[PDB]
Every structure is written in structure tokens, then in C-alpha cells.
Amino acid sequence: KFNKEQQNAFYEILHLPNLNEEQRNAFIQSLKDDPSQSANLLAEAKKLNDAQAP
Amino acid sequence: KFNKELSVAGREIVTLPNLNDPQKKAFIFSLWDDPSQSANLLAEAKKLNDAQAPK
Ligand SMILES: [Mg+2]
């Protein structure tokens, strides 16, 4: 499957400092839901992290 | 559900200061593969964080 792609997304999301608990949790759950949009979610997480930079 | 578990366990693991990157990535990947034993992975990761603390 696309396990490696979601594990990687999960890993990288854990390193986005400007995301809040709820958001990280949102991404995590969405990750396990549609393993296909993984790479997509990642990109969103990153853009969200910047959008929330101090 | 294990949703908060993975998030909190994940963050705690990545923030451990004496673990190197590859070790963190290994733990995180395992955490994902089996959210079931998250509690075990975290404890184990902490133990290793302690073993690698300054000597
Ligand atoms: Mg918050």
C-alpha cells in the first residue's frame, strides 16, 4: 500500500512547530482515513504551518 | 481514539533531546505501524533517551 507515504507524512507533520494540537490530530486522523491523499495533506500541513508562523 | 495518542506520543518522541534523528524516525514509523503499543514505544524511547544522556 502507501504505508511509507503516510508514515513519512506523519513524521514530517510532527516537526511542524506552528500547528496546534487539534490541527496535528486532524491531519493524523485524515492520514489514516484516505492514505491516498497523504502527500496532499502533507503539502497542506506545511502551508498551514507557515501561514501560522509567529 | 489513538488519534490524540499518536499526536502526543509523536511529539514527545520527536522532542526527546538525546535521541538521534534516525532513532526518532524509527520510533515514529513503528508508532504508525502499530498505534496499539504507542504507550510501549514512548516508554522505550524515553528509556533510550536516558541511556544516551550525557555520560
Ligand atoms: Mg491549541
Side-chain angles (χ1 to χ4, degrees):
Chain A
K1 225 198 77 301
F2 344 119
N3 202 62
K4 170 68 185 300
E5 297 183 63
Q6 62 201 315
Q7 288 170 305
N8 178 73
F10 177 45
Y11 182 69
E12 284 183 39
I13 287 174
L14 263 356
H15 294 71
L16 278 38
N18 309 319
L19 296 180
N20 62 234
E21 169 111 63
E22 322 89 85
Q23 304 184 308
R24 277 187 272 93
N25 268 149
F27 281 109
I28 271 53
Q29 182 63 285
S30 308
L31 233 37
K32 45 177 64 180
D33 274 32
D34 47 285
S36 56
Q37 201 186 191
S38 288
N40 177 63
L41 285 161
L42 218 201
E44 227 59 57
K46 300 176 176 177
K47 74 100 60 60
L48 180 51
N49 175 63
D50 285 324
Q52 298 182 172
Chain B
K1 194 162 59 183
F2 283 119
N3 237 69
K4 183 177 175 58
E5 265 292 297
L6 292 189
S7 183
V8 178
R11 284 296 291 179
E12 215 158 312
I13 285 166
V14 301
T15 54
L16 287 171
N18 309 312
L19 253 44
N20 61 61
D21 296 325
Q23 288 177 304
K24 287 174 179 185
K25 177 167 185 175
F27 273 98
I28 297 305
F29 273 40
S30 297
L31 198 60
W32 185 263
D33 286 314
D34 179 53
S36 180
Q37 247 169 54
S38 56
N40 276 72
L41 295 173
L42 191 277
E44 203 64 56
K46 284 186 174 178
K47 180 177 177 178
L48 195 61
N49 179 72
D50 197 349
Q52 297 168 188
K55 9 57 189 175

PDB file of all heavy atoms in Angstrom, chain A residues 30-46:
ATOM      1  N   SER A  30      -6.865  12.205   9.368  1.00  0.00           N
ATOM      2  CA  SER A  30      -7.102  12.263   7.924  1.00  0.00           C
ATOM      3  C   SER A  30      -6.100  11.380   7.188  1.00  0.00           C
ATOM      4  O   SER A  30      -6.376  10.837   6.115  1.00  0.00           O
ATOM      5  CB  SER A  30      -6.955  13.705   7.420  1.00  0.00           C
ATOM      6  OG  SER A  30      -7.752  14.604   8.173  1.00  0.00           O
ATOM      7  N   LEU A  31      -4.919  11.251   7.774  1.00  0.00           N
ATOM      8  CA  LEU A  31      -3.864  10.452   7.184  1.00  0.00           C
ATOM      9  C   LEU A  31      -4.288   8.996   7.128  1.00  0.00           C
ATOM     10  O   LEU A  31      -4.193   8.351   6.085  1.00  0.00           O
ATOM     11  CB  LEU A  31      -2.592  10.595   8.014  1.00  0.00           C
ATOM     12  CG  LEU A  31      -1.321  11.005   7.277  1.00  0.00           C
ATOM     13  CD1 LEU A  31      -1.621  12.011   6.192  1.00  0.00           C
ATOM     14  CD2 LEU A  31      -0.341  11.560   8.301  1.00  0.00           C
ATOM     15  N   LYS A  32      -4.765   8.480   8.254  1.00  0.00           N
ATOM     16  CA  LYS A  32      -5.183   7.092   8.296  1.00  0.00           C
ATOM     17  C   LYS A  32      -6.495   6.834   7.559  1.00  0.00           C
ATOM     18  O   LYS A  32      -6.790   5.695   7.201  1.00  0.00           O
ATOM     19  CB  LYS A  32      -5.284   6.613   9.747  1.00  0.00           C
ATOM     20  CG  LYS A  32      -5.990   7.571  10.676  1.00  0.00           C
ATOM     21  CD  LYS A  32      -6.103   6.993  12.085  1.00  0.00           C
ATOM     22  CE  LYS A  32      -4.741   6.784  12.738  1.00  0.00           C
ATOM     23  NZ  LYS A  32      -4.872   6.227  14.120  1.00  0.00           N
ATOM     24  N   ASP A  33      -7.279   7.883   7.322  1.00  0.00           N
ATOM     25  CA  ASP A  33      -8.550   7.721   6.618  1.00  0.00           C
ATOM     26  C   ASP A  33      -8.346   7.430   5.129  1.00  0.00           C
ATOM     27  O   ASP A  33      -8.678   6.342   4.654  1.00  0.00           O
ATOM     28  CB  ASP A  33      -9.428   8.966   6.805  1.00  0.00           C
ATOM     29  CG  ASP A  33     -10.259   8.909   8.084  1.00  0.00           C
ATOM     30  OD1 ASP A  33      -9.791   8.311   9.075  1.00  0.00           O
ATOM     31  OD2 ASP A  33     -11.375   9.470   8.106  1.00  0.00           O
ATOM     32  N   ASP A  34      -7.802   8.394   4.393  1.00  0.00           N
ATOM     33  CA  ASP A  34      -7.558   8.201   2.968  1.00  0.00           C
ATOM     34  C   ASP A  34      -6.064   8.225   2.655  1.00  0.00           C
ATOM     35  O   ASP A  34      -5.546   9.206   2.125  1.00  0.00           O
ATOM     36  CB  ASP A  34      -8.274   9.277   2.154  1.00  0.00           C
ATOM     37  CG  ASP A  34      -8.047  10.664   2.703  1.00  0.00           C
ATOM     38  OD1 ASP A  34      -8.656  10.993   3.743  1.00  0.00           O
ATOM     39  OD2 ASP A  34      -7.255  11.422   2.106  1.00  0.00           O
ATOM     40  N   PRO A  35      -5.355   7.131   2.973  1.00  0.00           N
ATOM     41  CA  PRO A  35      -3.913   7.008   2.735  1.00  0.00           C
ATOM     42  C   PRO A  35      -3.450   7.555   1.390  1.00  0.00           C
ATOM     43  O   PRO A  35      -2.261   7.797   1.185  1.00  0.00           O
ATOM     44  CB  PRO A  35      -3.678   5.511   2.860  1.00  0.00           C
ATOM     45  CG  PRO A  35      -4.641   5.130   3.944  1.00  0.00           C
ATOM     46  CD  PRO A  35      -5.896   5.892   3.565  1.00  0.00           C
ATOM     47  N   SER A  36      -4.392   7.745   0.475  1.00  0.00           N
ATOM     48  CA  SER A  36      -4.073   8.257  -0.846  1.00  0.00           C
ATOM     49  C   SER A  36      -3.740   9.752  -0.834  1.00  0.00           C
ATOM     50  O   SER A  36      -2.770  10.181  -1.465  1.00  0.00           O
ATOM     51  CB  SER A  36      -5.242   7.987  -1.800  1.00  0.00           C
ATOM     52  OG  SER A  36      -6.455   8.534  -1.302  1.00  0.00           O
ATOM     53  N   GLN A  37      -4.532  10.543  -0.111  1.00  0.00           N
ATOM     54  CA  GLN A  37      -4.308  11.988  -0.056  1.00  0.00           C
ATOM     55  C   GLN A  37      -3.136  12.383   0.856  1.00  0.00           C
ATOM     56  O   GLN A  37      -2.881  13.571   1.069  1.00  0.00           O
ATOM     57  CB  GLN A  37      -5.592  12.694   0.403  1.00  0.00           C
ATOM     58  CG  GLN A  37      -5.683  14.184   0.044  1.00  0.00           C
ATOM     59  CD  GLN A  37      -6.904  14.879   0.652  1.00  0.00           C
ATOM     60  OE1 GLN A  37      -7.233  16.021   0.305  1.00  0.00           O
ATOM     61  NE2 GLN A  37      -7.573  14.193   1.572  1.00  0.00           N
ATOM     62  N   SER A  38      -2.427  11.386   1.384  1.00  0.00           N
ATOM     63  CA  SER A  38      -1.290  11.636   2.267  1.00  0.00           C
ATOM     64  C   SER A  38      -0.400  12.761   1.757  1.00  0.00           C
ATOM     65  O   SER A  38      -0.309  13.826   2.379  1.00  0.00           O
ATOM     66  CB  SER A  38      -0.446  10.372   2.432  1.00  0.00           C
ATOM     67  OG  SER A  38      -1.120   9.417   3.224  1.00  0.00           O
ATOM     68  N   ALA A  39       0.259  12.526   0.629  1.00  0.00           N
ATOM     69  CA  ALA A  39       1.141  13.531   0.053  1.00  0.00           C
ATOM     70  C   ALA A  39       0.433  14.878  -0.056  1.00  0.00           C
ATOM     71  O   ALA A  39       1.057  15.927   0.094  1.00  0.00           O
ATOM     72  CB  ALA A  39       1.626  13.081  -1.311  1.00  0.00           C
ATOM     73  N   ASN A  40      -0.871  14.851  -0.308  1.00  0.00           N
ATOM     74  CA  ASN A  40      -1.626  16.092  -0.421  1.00  0.00           C
ATOM     75  C   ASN A  40      -1.739  16.778   0.936  1.00  0.00           C
ATOM     76  O   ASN A  40      -1.413  17.954   1.078  1.00  0.00           O
ATOM     77  CB  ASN A  40      -3.024  15.825  -0.973  1.00  0.00           C
ATOM     78  CG  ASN A  40      -3.866  17.086  -1.046  1.00  0.00           C
ATOM     79  OD1 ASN A  40      -3.537  18.024  -1.776  1.00  0.00           O
ATOM     80  ND2 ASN A  40      -4.950  17.122  -0.279  1.00  0.00           N
ATOM     81  N   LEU A  41      -2.212  16.036   1.931  1.00  0.00           N
ATOM     82  CA  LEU A  41      -2.361  16.570   3.277  1.00  0.00           C
ATOM     83  C   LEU A  41      -1.055  17.198   3.750  1.00  0.00           C
ATOM     84  O   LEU A  41      -1.042  18.301   4.301  1.00  0.00           O
ATOM     85  CB  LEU A  41      -2.794  15.451   4.229  1.00  0.00           C
ATOM     86  CG  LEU A  41      -4.266  15.060   4.059  1.00  0.00           C
ATOM     87  CD1 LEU A  41      -4.545  13.688   4.656  1.00  0.00           C
ATOM     88  CD2 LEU A  41      -5.129  16.131   4.710  1.00  0.00           C
ATOM     89  N   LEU A  42       0.045  16.493   3.514  1.00  0.00           N
ATOM     90  CA  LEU A  42       1.359  16.972   3.916  1.00  0.00           C
ATOM     91  C   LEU A  42       1.536  18.396   3.421  1.00  0.00           C
ATOM     92  O   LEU A  42       1.775  19.317   4.204  1.00  0.00           O
ATOM     93  CB  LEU A  42       2.450  16.093   3.309  1.00  0.00           C
ATOM     94  CG  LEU A  42       3.679  15.784   4.164  1.00  0.00           C
ATOM     95  CD1 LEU A  42       4.807  15.372   3.240  1.00  0.00           C
ATOM     96  CD2 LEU A  42       4.093  16.992   4.992  1.00  0.00           C
ATOM     97  N   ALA A  43       1.403  18.567   2.110  1.00  0.00           N
ATOM     98  CA  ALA A  43       1.550  19.877   1.491  1.00  0.00           C
ATOM     99  C   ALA A  43       0.690  20.920   2.185  1.00  0.00           C
ATOM    100  O   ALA A  43       1.104  22.067   2.344  1.00  0.00           O
ATOM    101  CB  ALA A  43       1.185  19.802   0.025  1.00  0.00           C
ATOM    102  N   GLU A  44      -0.507  20.523   2.601  1.00  0.00           N
ATOM    103  CA  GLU A  44      -1.413  21.452   3.265  1.00  0.00           C
ATOM    104  C   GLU A  44      -0.896  21.763   4.655  1.00  0.00           C
ATOM    105  O   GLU A  44      -0.888  22.917   5.083  1.00  0.00           O
ATOM    106  CB  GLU A  44      -2.822  20.861   3.361  1.00  0.00           C
ATOM    107  CG  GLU A  44      -3.919  21.822   2.936  1.00  0.00           C
ATOM    108  CD  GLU A  44      -3.732  22.297   1.504  1.00  0.00           C
ATOM    109  OE1 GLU A  44      -3.669  21.440   0.596  1.00  0.00           O
ATOM    110  OE2 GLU A  44      -3.645  23.524   1.287  1.00  0.00           O
ATOM    111  N   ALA A  45      -0.462  20.728   5.362  1.00  0.00           N
ATOM    112  CA  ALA A  45       0.057  20.925   6.706  1.00  0.00           C
ATOM    113  C   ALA A  45       1.173  21.953   6.638  1.00  0.00           C
ATOM    114  O   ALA A  45       1.193  22.917   7.397  1.00  0.00           O
ATOM    115  CB  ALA A  45       0.586  19.612   7.267  1.00  0.00           C
ATOM    116  N   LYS A  46       2.097  21.758   5.710  1.00  0.00           N
ATOM    117  CA  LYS A  46       3.215  22.682   5.583  1.00  0.00           C
ATOM    118  C   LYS A  46       2.762  24.111   5.314  1.00  0.00           C
ATOM    119  O   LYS A  46       3.242  25.047   5.950  1.00  0.00           O
ATOM    120  CB  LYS A  46       4.165  22.223   4.470  1.00  0.00           C
ATOM    121  CG  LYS A  46       4.777  20.847   4.699  1.00  0.00           C
ATOM    122  CD  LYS A  46       5.628  20.402   3.507  1.00  0.00           C
ATOM    123  CE  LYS A  46       6.306  19.070   3.789  1.00  0.00           C
ATOM    124  NZ  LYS A  46       7.091  18.554   2.625  1.00  0.00           N
TER     125      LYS A  46
END
